[PDB]
Design a protein around this ligand. Structure first.
Ligand SMILES: Cc1cc2c(cc1C)N(C[C@H](O)[C@H](O)[C@H](O)COP(=O)(O)O)c1[nH]c(=O)[nH]c(=O)c1N2
Ligand SMILES: Cc1cc2c(cc1C)N(C[C@H](O)[C@H](O)[C@H](O)COP(=O)(O)O)c1[nH]c(=O)[nH]c(=O)c1N2
Lengths: 359, 359
């Protein structure tokens, strides 16, 4: 089966094509991960997936989505990841991490605690920053502060420091979070970026924050380890063909700037959209980016059944299949998929103390 | 549903009737558990089961089954459990532990490493002890050393020390492993016990090691925490009705000696047997012990589908349903069972960072 073929990117080999995408846990304290994350991540790694990407980890305190988000904005924060990285490797999965800045969608409640911007008088909240002083709207009504050129320089440096810390903590795969309406996505989108300096206006100017951040990260991130990004390639906002064309152009620039693989997502930059959720709905979009930018891709948002995952790979829509919620339901989903696809010795997707008994 | 009704025994309340029975992992080193066990057990606890019983943990080095078995024969061994107990409690499951001595079935290879007695010239092996110098046979051909009265006193004291250490490590539930052909079961069975002193011959003498060990453990184990045992009530050796009658008599003695619940199993005392494996096959046997000894019971060996578990409880065959291998396959099996049985808000069988997304 295609799903259980190994994949090599730079010097890293994944044992199969199942990727666990970044999934926020909302269980950190002042950015510091703890035994929630250790057991969560080590358990997933033992479940058989080839790649495990740690949840959006903030490059700066104000770039957390919520008061429970993980951070890597100091050396102490980075050191907290070391035992988890070591546990993921011990299980034979490749440890990755998504580094992030939530921009105007920061300073929000946990999703089971309102999912909305934190109240003005709640001591947990903070001022958000963004390319322009324009609120997302709906449940995220707070108007962000318009970034200065010095803010831009500082956030880029925070991404560099974060990548350096990730490298030194032992991660073998990094993902820049330029999607889901967060800081990077919001610099790219005309909906959120109304700047009239070098970082707004034209396609080149809107792309600038993202391309400079990639180039700056590339300086510290090892050339033999995959350098990836997540990017929302359309919004379902009635501007899809022109947005996809620009997104594909940006993907070509990413590739030329050393990007090894693109995680293709939706923008979520604004609330007034009509996203056609359904099984594997991103497949054709991912395929188009893969073909037109000539870049490996992954995607998510409905590939979490074994036959869907297998079909997407065989059709060359995707190079890796990201499976998120099914792994929350069953951390051993890779074993389930191996069984479902009729893979030989499917139980040995799991480590011996499980596999021997399940044969 | 019955499966998701809480259960109270002494001062301990289980959130549902799903018990994860002891399952050896074969991953300890000189008895010391490690991050294999920590993540394994904490992950299971988060999966929703009401009770998680840690694998057979040796009261003495020679009472390990294998070189990978856990031990609690020193204070350092006990202290290693403390962070795991704390993680199980944090997840809302009740931490239990099975304390054990493998008797003539000790000094064996891991099941995926031959599953047989260790070779005479392998530096990892050791002399086994038993009521009588008689080998199990088949894949376990080593003849054990016949225990002296001082050996008996010493092993009883090892069980006491183990229970004291379990208590002080924070366990809220203990299980004496008097089953599966190990030391305790082998004292009870006429197949393995040919002694002519106070510990062999008559029913009272064969029962003596088990009853004295229970009474000795009871002295140190808190009266407000469940005190349980696993016991093989028949062998499927052509002597079933007489063996079950004696086993039920022993269960009555256990109850009179402060046993709160009996895990009903098969003996596995000798290899020449004909066990009728099948779904829920132990149900009627467990029900008979429950009724005739008037003692709460659990059992296992084929209850691992949600409808089977629910039926066994509704029929009052069992008080708790032990589900083993299905939890190795899917550590979130309790969530799966909740969904299958149509339990309201089934995803909240899991903690918030999973449940919110699976609703
Ligand atoms: C709990 C959890 C939390 C997150 C996510 C999701 C969920 C379920 N998602 C999106 C996620 O990576 C994925 O795209 C979706 O889960 C869709 O894939 P599935 O359909 O779930 O397989 C997500 N995406 C991301 O880029 N960074 C993150 O940290 C998060 N946070
Ligand atoms: C990997 C593993 C290891 C063990 C077990 C089993 C397995 C699968 N079993 C037996 C176990 O508790 C249970 O009785 C069986 O697994 C049958 O129940 P299921 O059919 O698997 O639900 C077991 N029993 C026991 O009393 N102490 C133990 O430590 C072990 N070791």
């Amino acid at each position: 089966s295609a799903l259980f073929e190994p994949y090599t990117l730079k010097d890293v080999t994944l044992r199969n094509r199942i990727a666990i995408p970044p999934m926020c846990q909302y269980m950190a304290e002042d950015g510091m991960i703890n035994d929630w994350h250790h057991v969560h991540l080590a358990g997933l790694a033992r479940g058989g997936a080839g790649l495990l990407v740690v949840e959006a980890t903030a490059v700066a305190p104000e770039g957390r989505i919520t008061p429970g988000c993980a951070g890597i904005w100091s050396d102490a924060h980075a050191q907290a990841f070391v035992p988890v990285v070591q546990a993921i490797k011990a299980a034979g999965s490749v440890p990755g991490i998504q580094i992030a800045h939530a921009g105007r969608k920061a300073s929000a409640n946990r999703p089971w605690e309102g999912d909305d911007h934190i109240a003005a008088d709640d001591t947990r909240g903070w001022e958000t920053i963004a390319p322009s002083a324009i609120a997302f709207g709906a449940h995220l009504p707070k108007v962000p502060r318009e970034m200065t050129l010095d803010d831009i320089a500082r956030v880029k440096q925070d991404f560099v420091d974060a990548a350096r810390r990730a490298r030194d903590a032992g991660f073998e795969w990094i993902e820049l979070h330029f999607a889901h309406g967060f800081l990077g996505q919001s610099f790219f989108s005309e909906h959120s970026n109304k700047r009239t300096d070098a970082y707004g206006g034209s396609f080149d100017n809107r792309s600038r924050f993202l391309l400079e951040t990639l180039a700056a990260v590339r300086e510290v991130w090892p050339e033999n380890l995959p350098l990836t990004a997540r990017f929302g390639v359309l919004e379902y906002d009635g501007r899809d063909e022109q947005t996809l064309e620009e997104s594909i152009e940006l993907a070509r620039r990413f590739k030329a700037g050393g990007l090894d693989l693109l995680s293709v997502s939706v923008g979520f930059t604004i609330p007034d959209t009509n996203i056609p959720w359904g099984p594997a709905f991103m497949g054709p979009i991912a395929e188009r980016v893969r073909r037109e930018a000539k870049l490996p891709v992954t995607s998510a948002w409905g590939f979490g059944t074994p036959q869907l995952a297998e079909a997407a790979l065989q059709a060359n829509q995707l190079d890796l299949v990201s499976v998120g919620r099914a792994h929350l339901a069953d951390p051993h989903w890779a074993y389930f998929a191996a069984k479902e696809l009729g893979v030989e010795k499917a139980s040995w997707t799991l480590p011996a103390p499980y596999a021997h008994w399940l044969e």
